[PDB]
Amino acid sequence: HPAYPMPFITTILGGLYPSKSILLSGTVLPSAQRFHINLCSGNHIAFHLNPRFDENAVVRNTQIDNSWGSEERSLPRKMPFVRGQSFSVWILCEAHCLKVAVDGQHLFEYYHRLRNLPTINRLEVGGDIQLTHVQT
Amino acid sequence: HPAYPMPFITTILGGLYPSKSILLSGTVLPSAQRFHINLCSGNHIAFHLNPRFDENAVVRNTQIDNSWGSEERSLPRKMPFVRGQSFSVWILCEAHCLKVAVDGQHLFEYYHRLRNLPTINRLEVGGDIQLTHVQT
Amino acid sequence: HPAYPMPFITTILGGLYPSKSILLSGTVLPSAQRFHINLCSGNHIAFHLNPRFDENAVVRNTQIDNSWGSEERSLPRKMPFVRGQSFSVWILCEAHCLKVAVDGQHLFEYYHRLRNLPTINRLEVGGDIQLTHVQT
Numbered sequence A, B, C: 001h002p003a004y005p006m007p008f009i010t011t012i013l014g015g016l017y018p019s020k021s022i023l024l025s026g027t028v029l030p031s032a033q034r035f036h037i038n039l040c041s042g043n044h045i046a047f048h049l050n051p052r053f054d055e056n057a058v059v060r061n062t063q064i065d066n067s068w069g070s071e072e073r074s075l076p077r078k079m080p081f082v083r084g085q086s087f088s089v090w091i092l093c094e095a096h097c098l099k100v101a102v103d104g105q106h107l108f109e110y111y112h113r114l115r116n117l118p119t120i121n122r123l124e125v126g127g128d129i130q131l132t133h134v135q136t
């Protein structure tokens, strides 16, 4: 499974909309500090998924231009991402929010801050992981 | 090869057209009963590929709203899908029909019933299989 | 990793544009002679990537209708493709050229000959390889 280049940046033609799903799989590097998945719109980051091993947390936020909003860190269970372990992320878009699952199990919801879904037409993946697959 | 969520539903931007191909791979579960692949248009199922292990057959049909048409079950050879065995499905769209191959070998043709190809813009996969990859 | 059909032909909706990337992975057959990757526009081959084991070279060219232009064969290092060995090709599109990397390492640049990027909307892969994945 040859890896994707990192960072990986690709446009999501048509943008987002209810029932739209973005899937990603790969492996967290052995000594990973952090890695992220961004759903961007022009110059803004509509959704920022930032798992942090240095902080043992999963940070989610939105950046408008140069401004980060208020972070959301709550998790229903233990940090699902593990160093050196393969993973899969399923981002499902709904009308009111994004639903994120990790390794087949729902993890959290993120209410839209940028609601013009069609304008969220760019995916960026970077950080300490080996990206092996993307389904947009 | 992390699996896709099931059922898997994704839009085929631009719909179908001659030379358009949809590829899928995965593994039939050990005790699979049935699984299907649908090419949908709005509220209709333009093409329904339904391999059945309980009946040992490969059923193809079209549903307009709530009405299933006349089923097509003929096969040139033995049922290619096997429980617990990996497979690949290649659906090639032509002007007059869809040509389906399984594991690299042509299996059957399905003449279009819904001929407005561009309107066939949705793919649904469900049933007793582990879906590992899709190329639309 | 079930293989893709060969030759593999798929449309690149929206065509090319700066920052657009096409990724491919697969395995060169044991006794491969040659294989190619084409970025086409209507009836022209905007970009032709033709690794040749019989000549031990990597040929790049453009075909307008029935006319092949002047070939580019220069390589900064040894032929990266090896018979029976897996590989990955990353084609990055920029405003002035295409940047090609093989197995994660930049290999060469190809200045655009057909500059109407959006019109380069078709990918063709053929020849002596087992194509296991494409990301357009």
Ligand SMILES: CC(=O)N[C@@H]1[C@@H](O)[C@H](O[C@@H]2O[C@H](CO)[C@H](O)[C@H](O)[C@H]2O)[C@@H](CO)O[C@@H]1O
Residues within 6 Å of the ligand: A048, A050, A059, A060, A061, A068, A069, A071
């Ligand atoms: C607890 C807390 O508020 N800490 C924050 C850091 O999380 C924050 O780091 C940035 O966070 C954003 C997402 O909110 C991006 O991930 C960015 O890459 C991080 O640098 C810093 C900086 O804003 O502020 C506090 O330390």
Ligand SMILES: CC(=O)N[C@@H]1[C@@H](O)[C@H](O[C@@H]2O[C@H](CO)[C@H](O)[C@H](O)[C@H]2O)[C@@H](CO)O[C@@H]1O
Residues within 6 Å of the ligand: B048, B050, B059, B060, B061, B068, B069, B071
């Ligand atoms: C031999 C025969 O005609 N049997 C049919 C069943 O195949 C049919 O089951 C449905 O078939 C459609 C496709 O034609 C869908 O797969 C659907 O999910 C099945 O339930 C039933 C019901 O229409 O009628 C006969 O039994």
Ligand SMILES: CC(=O)N[C@@H]1[C@@H](O)[C@H](O[C@@H]2O[C@H](CO)[C@H](O)[C@H](O)[C@H]2O)[C@@H](CO)O[C@@H]1O
Residues within 6 Å of the ligand: C048, C050, C059, C060, C061, C068, C069, C071
């Ligand atoms: C050294 C040299 O000029 N040799 C060329 C061949 O490379 C060329 O072969 C064709 O090359 C084009 C790309 O330039 C395509 O790959 C095509 O499939 C090849 O047949 C031949 C024919 O034009 O001319 C010289 O021999």
Ligand code: NI
Residues within 6 Å of the ligand: A133, A134, A135, B133, B134, B135, C133, C134, C135
């Ligand atoms: Ni893929």
